[PDB]
Nucleic acid binder design. Structure first.
Ligand code: MG
Ligand code: MG
Ligand code: MG
Ligand code: MG
Ligand code: MG
Ligand code: MG
Ligand code: MG
Ligand code: MG
Ligand code: MG
Ligand code: MG
Lengths: 108, 103, 103, 110
DNA sequence: GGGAAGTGTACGCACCAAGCGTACAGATGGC
DNA sequence: GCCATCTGTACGCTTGGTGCGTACACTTCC
């Protein structure tokens, strides 16, 4: 009753960070609670979730960025990475994402 | 960093926009909603008969009182939800039984 | 294939006698009998916290009433034997949880 | 039953995989530990037992046989052979008498 | 820095499951 | 070819689980 769509980047890297079984349990967890990931401030609703943590495991960990499309029960899984291998999004980037997200929401 | 966040996030959101428009194909996995599991006494008996096991041995391997399993198969009591779940787990993946005894 | 019963039984029985005397090495697998499984409320909480799941989500994935799981973790009731078995199955083999949801 | 041990013959070890999966074999060991008398005694052999597996019902048509001997005082199962139901001839009276004599001499020794 | 869910705490209550004890009734397995 | 053994039937009963229905506080996120 819920659908997950992997980006090409996610598809290329998912297996390096997540086992298949971990991924199945992850899908079940997200379907039960589409708000599990925290909203990234100023981006128009993109969510970020750490899922390689057995509870408060902040230091270790894989990260997934996703977006929940109310219509169709559909999750877009945008990227997957190691916890400290990625730069942050600066204010201009966030403003650009917020505008993009607003244009989608306006289109629908 | 060998990988810059914005480049991947941008490529992924333009992929998402194109998939929503219907102009692009991406690998998709669905998952079905959780169900209301139920089981009849006949189904319990048939599960156990699939293993060619007596009531006692089956109960023992499932960490279950054989008198309780008797209650279920005779239809005296309705199994608790976890019992139904466990039974259906064994029915669907019979190798689980060995692992259940292994605990 | 061409396979003789008496010949194989004879070879196997001379191996068995020699092994019992201790003059021969044969492949051996032990198995422990099933044990009396139990679980404390704190152990239930720790199991669920290992998944970093709220009570509701965990109960939902285990086909369990969240109010009954509440009773267990607050220590109001002792979980039924099958619940203990199920919980410890998930604890030791966490992949089982997804399959339990799949039913 | 604090603990039980299974000892595969070389012949059993050589053929088990053609007839039993590892999972099937694991469940079989658990079944036997629970009931060491699961297999029916082969008449006149001094206590050898034969058990049908891989059958949920109408097990004659279904595949395989295991012959074993249980050493009670050591809680030790000797798994002697494994075969398909119509792959092997039967034991005539002289063969059974010879097996009975071997088992009795062995049991007599200790 | 306010508001609102989002999580937990605990108690009471009707139904009935759990796990026997106990008396019988057949079905096989060991010589 | 007449035995325990093995494997099932059924009912009664004491103890406690179960699954809320309800009131009520901290807290993590908006
Ligand atoms: Mg049936
Ligand atoms: Mg808690
Ligand atoms: Mg704890
Ligand atoms: Mg643990
Ligand atoms: Mg552990
Ligand atoms: Mg082998
Ligand atoms: Mg009792
Ligand atoms: Mg009793
Ligand atoms: Mg009979
Ligand atoms: Mg009870």
């Amino acid at each position: 009753k819920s659908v997950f769509v992997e980006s090409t980047i996610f598809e290329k890297y998912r297996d390096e960070y997540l086992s298949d079984e971990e991924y199945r349990l992850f899908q079940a967890e997200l379907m039960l609670n589409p708000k599990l990931g925290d909203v990234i401030q100023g981006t128009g609703g993109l969510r970020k979730i750490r899922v390689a943590s057995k509870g408060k495991g902040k230091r270790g960990g894989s990260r997934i960025i996703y977006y929940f499309l109310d219509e169709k029960r559909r999750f877009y899984l945008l990227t997957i990475y190691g916890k400290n291998e990625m730069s942050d999004l600066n204010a201009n980037q966030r403003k650009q994402l917020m505008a993009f997200m607003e244009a989608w929401r306006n289109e629908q | 960093s060998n990988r810059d966040l914005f480049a991947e996030l941008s490529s992924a959101l333009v992929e998402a926009k194109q998939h929503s428009e219907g102009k692009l194909t991406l690998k998709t996995h669905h998952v079905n909603d959780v169900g209301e599991l139920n089981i009849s006494p006949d189904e319990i008996v048939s599960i156990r008969e699939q293993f060619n096991m007596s009531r006692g041995v089956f109960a023992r391997l499932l960490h279950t009182s054989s008198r309780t399993l008797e209650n279920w198969e005779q239809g005296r009591s309705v199994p608790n939800g976890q019992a139904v779940t466990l039974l259906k787990l064994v029915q669907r993946h019979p190798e689980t039984l060995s692992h259940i005894a292994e605990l």
